[PDB]
Amino acid sequence: LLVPKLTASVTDGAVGVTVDAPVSVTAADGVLAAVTMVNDNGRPVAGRLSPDGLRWSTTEQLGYNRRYTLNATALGLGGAATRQLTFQTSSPAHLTMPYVMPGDGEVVGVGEPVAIRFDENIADRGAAEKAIKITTNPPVEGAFYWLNNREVRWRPEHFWKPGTAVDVAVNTYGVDLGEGMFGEDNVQTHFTIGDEVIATADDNTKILTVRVNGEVVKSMPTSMGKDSTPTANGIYIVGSRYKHIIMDSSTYGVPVNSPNGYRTDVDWATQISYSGVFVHSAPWSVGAQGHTNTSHGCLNVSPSNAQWFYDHVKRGDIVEVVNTVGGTLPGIDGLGDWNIPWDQWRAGNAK
Template sequence: MLLRRRTSRIGRRNTRLGLIAGTVVALTVLLMGCSSNAAPRPPQVIADKGDPYSELLVPTLQSSVADGAVGVAVDSPVTVTAGDGVLGPVTMVNADGIPVDGQLSPDGVTWATTEPLGYNKQYTLHAEALGLGGITRNSMTFQTQSPKNLTMPYVMPNNGEVVGVGQPIAVRFDEDIPNRLAAQNAISVVTTPPVDGAFYWLSSREVRWRPAEYWKPGTTVEVSVKTYGVDLGNGLFGQDDLSTRFTIGDQIIATADDSTKTLSVRRNGELIKTMPMSMGKDSTPTDNGAYIIGDRYPNLIMDSSTYGVPVNSPDGYRLDVDWATQMS
């Protein structure tokens, strides 16, 4: 019986080995069958598309004008700005090839014209931007605005004058101004110390600025009339810019008293002179109120015919007057 048990164990062991061997053979056959039926796997190839960030590093150019633009304003500078880099050479020329002055910003990113452009002119702009991704170049040609008509401003008081405390600022144009607000917005008045004031129009061609109160002696006044490039209405543009700087002198006030026929003159509140005056005819009285002294002449012919009264009529006259002054 012991012999039978051993035989039985050996038989089971051989059976297990046979199963394992059969399994290995079957697995080998299966693997070989798969290998023989599959095509060779192609090698993996990675295409070289370059640096994926290179396009992001290419510099860009942006300009305030577009190629082929017409009617470009002349009162604003033309600018060119580099993105993702700095500017290289920038040139701008007119139709005759004459360069236009311009200036590069300290960081090298923006270029802007520093001189006014002309009306109805053609300009060509060339610019380069330099960056890590290379160089970008751009060229454009454009034309400025073409006004239907131009008007020239004239400003008073003149530059460097010393004027009285009642002196208004006058800006006169040689054309009627359709858009008065546009004209006013083009005029700046800067005073030291600051003074409040307002505009008012005497006619369609003359605007004035007067302080709310009399000027203080010693006040400095700077007036800038920047109408060049400004549309003043109906295709009328400013022909040029003007400026003036003047100073307010002593307070000199002359008071005319019709009851005593006397003119009293005070400087800074102190009476310095009195003189007799006729005050004219009773039929043409002078209205009460405050007047300012305008134009002054060492000698002037006063002729009644200049306002429609013949010299040889009863109310006519023609007089040679010294130290004539205009009051208004």
């Protein structure tokens, strides 16, 4: 007769076993009659046996720097076979935790990139990218690009089509992200693209025009950066929205006590760059809005229009600035992703 054969997904005596996959045992020419797995302290590991008795797998994630011992017995008409296997899992030098935006279940605008931010510098960007699975429906091509040593972004060539579902699975637990840095955990988030909302601030008219699904719905007189502190041209992604916010220049790098510093409370403020540009209520400049530029870079509008903007724009909507005397918003600003040409974005910078 034929003696049962056992096949494990680990080898006895292995070291550095990664914990990004379950551990399995398979029987052939027989069935699994006993399968147990314990850690170094004797703590059992939860598992599940298939109804046909041929396949057993762990059902909870295994830990770092552990020693596991697997005992399996297979029985068949032709005899019995028993094996004992002991293996050692990865021993990270450090862990890093990923943080994903936008939030799970959110509806966002057509400019919203997927963002994965780690709390440590990532030595092996390629490994991180390979560990992140992005599903889109309808499917569209996209690509990864790193804004700095810790945050990676994914987006398509053109703005998203409304109604697209986007699923983000960051499967970094057990993955070596370089230099002994392993993922602290997995994260899973899902979001959806809503209406197309694109607002254009044209320096030639000093008007901020809001288009919803292609139709002009609001035309807002604005005052942008004066010549000495101009507003940069380019594509801005709407970020966070505030009924009011204490605008403190030191958050954007400039001491309040410096000549260009400031600390003032502002109403109805919508963030459009990490450098600190907002659409906001500006009662002090209503006389100049629609005529001349008087601000330090923000888009000043009236209180009523700033509240309208707050109420009708969402994270990931788009503000485009054109014809100013400024330069172009940096692509790595944090909300300036779309100013990177697609060929450069697509090629990436994983190194």
